C-alpha cells in the first residue's frame, strides 16, 4: 500500500505515535516519507547483509526475523514480512520498541539526516487529525 501523507498521519496518530517518547506526529510522518516514500512494501538491503522492511524500514539485524541475517535478533518477535502489510500495526508496535532503545529517533538514519531539527509540523499540514 502507498499511503497518502494525511492517511498515514491519521493511522500513526490512532496507533499512539503522536508524542510517543516525546516525538511529535510530524517526526514520524517525515521519517516514513524518507524511509519508504509511504510505501508499506518497501524493502532495502543494507551493506551489513541485513534488510530493512516497510513503512518505517525496520531492520533485521535487531528487530525482526527474515532468516537471512546471520547473528541477528528478533526483538519485536515478528517475521520481517509482517512489516510489509497494508495494516501498519506491527510496524508501529515495533517502532515503539526501537524509539525506546536509548537513542530516540536517531535509530532511523534518514530521520537524523533529513528530519531532525527541521519544520516537521509541515508533514501534517492540511490534515484533519
Q: State the residues that interact with Cl ion by CB under 5 A.
A: 5, 24-26, 65, 67, 69, 72, 79, 104, 121
- Residues composing the chain: 129
Output 19 or 86, the one with its CB closest to Cl ion.
19
d(CA 9, CA 78): 23
Cα separations in angstroms, 117 against 28, 80, 107, 112: 13, 30, 15, 8
Tell me whether residue 41 or residue 82 sits nearer to Cl ion (CB atom): 82
CB of 55 to Cl ion, least distance (A): 13
Smaller CB distance to Cl ion: residue 15 or 104?
104
* Residue least distant from Cl ion (Cβ): 26
CB of 12 to Cl ion, least distance (A): 11
Nearest distance from C-beta of residue 86 to Cl ion, angstroms = 18
User: Which residues contact residue 111 at a Cβ distance below 8 angstroms, ignoring those fewer than 6 apart?
Assistant: 27, 30, 31, 34, 35, 105
**Angle in degrees, 0-180, between the axes of helices 5-14 and 25-36, rounded to the nearest 10:** 130
The least distance separating Cl ion from the CB of residue 30, rounded to whole angstroms, comes to 8
Nearer to Cl ion, 40 or 69 (CB): 69
Amino acid at each position: 500500500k502507498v499511503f497518502g501523507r494525511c492517511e498515514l498521519a491519521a493511522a500513526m496518530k490512532r496507533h499512539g505515535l503522536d508524542n510517543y517518547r516525546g516525538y511529535s506526529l510530524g517526526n514520524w510522518v517525515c521519517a516514513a516519507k524518507f524511509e519508504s516514500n509511504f510505501n508499506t512494501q518497501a524493502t532495502n538491503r543494507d551493506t551489513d547483509g541485513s534488510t530493512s522492511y516497510g513503512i518505517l524500514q525496520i531492520n533485521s539485524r535487531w528487530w525482526c526475523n527474515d532468516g537471512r541475517t546471520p547473528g541477528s535478533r528478533n526483538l519485536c518477535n515478528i517475521p520481517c514480512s509482517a512489516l510489509l502489510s497494508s495494516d501498519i500495526t506491527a510496524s508501529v508496535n515495533c517502532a515503539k520498541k526501537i524509539v525506546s532503545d536509548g537513542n530516540g529517533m536517531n535509530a532511523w538514519v534518514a530521520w537524523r539526516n533529513r528530519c531532525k531539527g527541521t519544520d516537521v509540523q509541515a508533514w501534517i499540514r492540511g490534515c484533519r487529525l
